[PDB]
Amino acid sequence: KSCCRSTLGRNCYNLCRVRGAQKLCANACRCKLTSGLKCPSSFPK
Amino acid sequence: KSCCRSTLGRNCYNLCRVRGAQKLCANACRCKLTSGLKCPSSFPK
Numbered sequence: 714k715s716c717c718r719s720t721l722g723r724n725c726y727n728l729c730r731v732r733g734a735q736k737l738c739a740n741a742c743r744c745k746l747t748s749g750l751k752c753p754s755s756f757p758k
Numbered sequence: 759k760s761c762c763r764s765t766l767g768r769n770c771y772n773l774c775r776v777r778g779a780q781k782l783c784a785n786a787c788r789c790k791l792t793s794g795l796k797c798p799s800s801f802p803k
């Protein structure tokens with residue numbers, strides 16, 4: 714599951730993932746990857 | 759040429775670009791593409 718800081722970070726991640734892998738795009742867009750079922754509140758998007 | 763707003767934006771763009779195209783990564787990372795050789799001072803990174 715990806716968890717991003719803001720809507721800007723979410724649109725970064727989703728566009729990046731068109732060609733890019735999860736870990737690569739999480740680091741580019743400052744999102745968090747988690748195996749949890751919900752995101753922490755600091756990374757809600 | 760790619761022109762980014764910040765160091766974080768440049769990092770974003772460079773990572774995205776490992777597998778993504780220029781236009782897509784510029785949109786994701788909020789950078790601008792220019793045909794010229796000078797970046798707008800608003801997009802200096």
Ligand SMILES: Cc1ccc(S(=O)(=O)O)cc1
Nearest residue numbers: 718719721722725743787
């Ligand atoms: C392009 C972009 C802008 C801002 C962020 S954020 O500050 O991590 O939400 C991530 C990605």
Ligand SMILES: Cc1ccc(S(=O)(=O)O)cc1
Nearest residue numbers: 742763764766767770788
């Ligand atoms: C991750 C990240 C944070 C912030 C930006 S920027 O606001 O476009 O400089 C781009 C990318």
